[PDB]
Design a protein around this ligand. Structure first.
Ligand SMILES: */C=C\C(=O)NCCCNc1nc(N2CCCC2)nc2cc(OCCN)c(OC)cc12
Ligand SMILES: C#CC(=O)NCCCNc1nc(N2CCCC2)nc2cc(OCCN)c(OC)cc12
Lengths: 145, 140
């Protein structure tokens, strides 16, 4: 098995996890009854898929509408992530309060997760991959990469 | 009298003195603002102070702020005289207007105050406020 073939089977494993929505290997951090972060409950190797930043994938026109509606209510939060993909502006809108864990992962300048665009049939997905080997029990912390 | 009253609100905005309020501290973190004196309905409370910029410089800053989630989301956009402005309160400062929490049933509301054609976003009392109340804003 070549490196190219190993990368193909990895992408297929990520496709299956994205479309199944299963988010194993992680759990919510609780202080004072509030979901404040996410802890790894299993090892992750450098480059392994961790979780998707899940949300509605939309373009700028729909996004600017939602943003004006969201501004009227601070209870929403700022969860709209903008990015370029193949000379095209996209937005992942995770405003919606859900059980998904990707939007609960805290930022750190020296985190253990970084962002990456994962293509499925030409549709970009923002995923978090391990920027280094992660031990079980670590808080997951993301930076932009 | 009208000219005089409008001049006093201007002086408050320009002097930057923010009397009648104080920080609410939990765990050493500034989390809210408490009134230390009464306010009557319609009284000036505080400015949401920041850089007043237009749509071009605003997007340039917002993308730069996005790469650093430790900044927070402090850019407030609004229309004034058929022109889009933004008040950028991102810089962490001692100003208290950016510390006031939002509540659908708050005691403060937003209002645009003109100073020589330049809009300022201020908070006014939407009802009589007793001393000791937490200041909570909504959009008016
Ligand atoms: C994600 C973007 C977003 O939420 N934008 C909302 C508008 C900009 N941010 C804030 N705007 C205000 N005001 C607008 C005019 C009147 C007051 N106030 C706050 C206060 C904030 O902290 C309050 C204490 N937690 C924050 O925190 C980021 C933002 C704004
Ligand atoms: C203002 C505006 C603004 O700040 N825009 C930033 C991008 C959109 N917002 C967010 N993006 C992301 N990511 C984007 C891809 C990688 C992860 N993660 C977030 C996690 C959050 O809470 C974690 C628990 N404290 C959160 O709380 C509101 C917002 C997040």
């Amino acid at each position: 098995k070549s490196k190219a073939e190993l990368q193909s089977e990895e992408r297929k494993r990520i496709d299956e996890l994205i479309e199944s929505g299963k988010e194993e290997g992680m759990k919510i951090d609780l202080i004072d009854g509030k979901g404040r972060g996410v802890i790894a409950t299993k090892q992750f190797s450098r480059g392994d898929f961790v979780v998707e930043y899940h949300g509605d994938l939309i373009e700028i026109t729909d996004a600017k509408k939602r943003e004006a509606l969201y501004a009227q209510d601070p209870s929403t939060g700022c969860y709209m992530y903008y990015f370029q993909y193949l000379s095209k502006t996209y937005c992942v809108d995770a405003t919606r309060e859900t059980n998904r864990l990707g939007r609960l992962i805290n930022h750190s300048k020296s985190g253990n997760c970084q962002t990456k665009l994962h293509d499925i049939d030409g549709v970009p997905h923002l995923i978090l991959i391990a920027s280094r080997d992660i031990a079980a029990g670590e808080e997951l912390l993301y930076d932009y990469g």
